[PDB]
Amino acid sequence: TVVTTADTSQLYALAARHGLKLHGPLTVNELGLDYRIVIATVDDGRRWVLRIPRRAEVSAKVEPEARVLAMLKNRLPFAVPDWRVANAELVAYPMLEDSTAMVIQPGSSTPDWVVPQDSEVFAESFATALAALHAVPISAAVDAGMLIRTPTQARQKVADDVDRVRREFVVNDKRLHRWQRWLDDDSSWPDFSVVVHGDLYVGHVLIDNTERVSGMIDWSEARVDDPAIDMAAHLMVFGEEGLAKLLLTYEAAGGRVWPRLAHHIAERLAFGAVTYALFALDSGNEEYLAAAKAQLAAAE
Ligand SMILES: CO[C@H]1C[C@H](O[C@H]2[C@H](C)[C@@H](O[C@@H]3O[C@H](C)C[C@H](N(C)C)[C@H]3O)[C@@H](C)C[C@]3(CO3)C(=O)[C@H](C)[C@@H](O)[C@@H](C)[C@@H](C)OC(=O)[C@@H]2C)O[C@@H](C)[C@@H]1O
Numbered sequence: 570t571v572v573t574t575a576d577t578s579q580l581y582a583l584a585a586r587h588g589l590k591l592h593g594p595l596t597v598n599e600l601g602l603d604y605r606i607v608i609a610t611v612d613d614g615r616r617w618v619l620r621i622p623r624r625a626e627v628s629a630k631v632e633p634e635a636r637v638l639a640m641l642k643n644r645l646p647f648a649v650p651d652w653r654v655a656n657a658e659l660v661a662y663p664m665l666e667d668s669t670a671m672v673i674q675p676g677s678s679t680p681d682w683v684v685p686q687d688s689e690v691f692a693e694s695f696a697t698a699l700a701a702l703h704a705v706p707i708s709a710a711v712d713a714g715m716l717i718r719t720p721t722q723a724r725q726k727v728a729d730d731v732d733r734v735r736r737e738f739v740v741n742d743k744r745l746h747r748w749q750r751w752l753d754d755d756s757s758w759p760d761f762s763v764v765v766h767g768d769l770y771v772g773h774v775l776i777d778n779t780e781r782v783s784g785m786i787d788w789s790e791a792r793v794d795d796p797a798i799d800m801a802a803h804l805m806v807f808g809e810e811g812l813a814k815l816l817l818t819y820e821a822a823g824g825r826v827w828p829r830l831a832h833h834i835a836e837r838l839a840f841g842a843v844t845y846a847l848f849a850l851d852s853g854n855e856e857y858l859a860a861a862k863a864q865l866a867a868a869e
Pocket residue numbers: 673677678679680768770772790801802805806837838841842844845848
């Protein structure tokens with residue numbers, strides 16, 4: 570006998586209650602604070618991804634995300650998870666086998682690999698994939714019951730997140746002034762909203778062998794909101810030079826821009842500290858809280 574992290578008996582039973590017969594190799598990730606993620610082989614010879622909600626509050630998010638993915642399936646020139654199982658105890662989809670555009674071993678803080686900066690195919694295809702996403706009609710989002718934020722609601726959300734952080738944490742004075750200046754800087758904010766992925770960075774982008782964008786995963790934050798939400802992580806990973814490339818191609822591909830968009834993206838990236846801190850707070854995890862407080866108190 571060998572102790573293994575996965576409880577195969579329980580996993581089999583859970584999957585079989587929803588029409589999936591597990592058989593063969595699997596792999597498990599318990600790092601997630603909200604889901605257990607298992608990649609398992611099924612009797613169709615295929616790997617499937619099991620997204621297992623940990624708690625009732627997480628389960629409640631399954632049905633609205635299912636509606637999002639159902640709408641998005643035909644409206645994107647790349648793959649998204651096909652939630653053939655979607656219920657409160659289990660989400661399951663056939664694995665999109667293409668690699669993520671960042672590879673990182675579970676538990677590690679350092680990736681093994683990130684698609685290279687000088688990958689022209691990745692840069693170009695990510696820019697056109699993003700333009701396609703942001704071109705999904707708002708009417709389709711509304712019909713799918715998505716969370717919708719007008720430009721005013723988008724700005725208010727940011728203000729509310731900042732204010733929650735200010736109530737709960739002690740924040741570096743220059744940071745606070747930075748966020749407030751941004752919130753007051755009318756020229757920075759867009760006068761429209763788009764369908765956004767909401768958690769978009771190289772870790773949630775899939776690429777084929779040639780490094781062409783072939784899919785996106787983890788759509789749990791998707792909504793109609795500020796387009797720049799989906800560009801801040803590109804700036805973080807690929808820098809200003811990469812952002813500049815992104816924005817030229819994005820616009821050429823029909824993505825709607827505005828004059829201070831690059832500025833706004835950098836301000837959105839700074840605002841990541843708020844997002845992180847609220848994630849830390851809402852999780853109650855002490856290591857995440859320690860990191861968040863340290864960051865918030867630190868000069869940028
Ligand atoms: C654009 O701004 C980003 C910038 C940066 O975005 C992150 C990212 C993706 C965050 O994940 C996101 O964290 C939020 C709180 C929740 C979110 N989803 C679960 C919902 C999750 O994906 C991380 C904090 C994940 C985390 C904690 O394990 C790490 O510390 C890991 C080691 C992380 O540094 C690396 C993998 C680097 C290479 O990733 C990048 O920097 C991207 C750009 O951190 C975010 C807070 C900002 O929103």
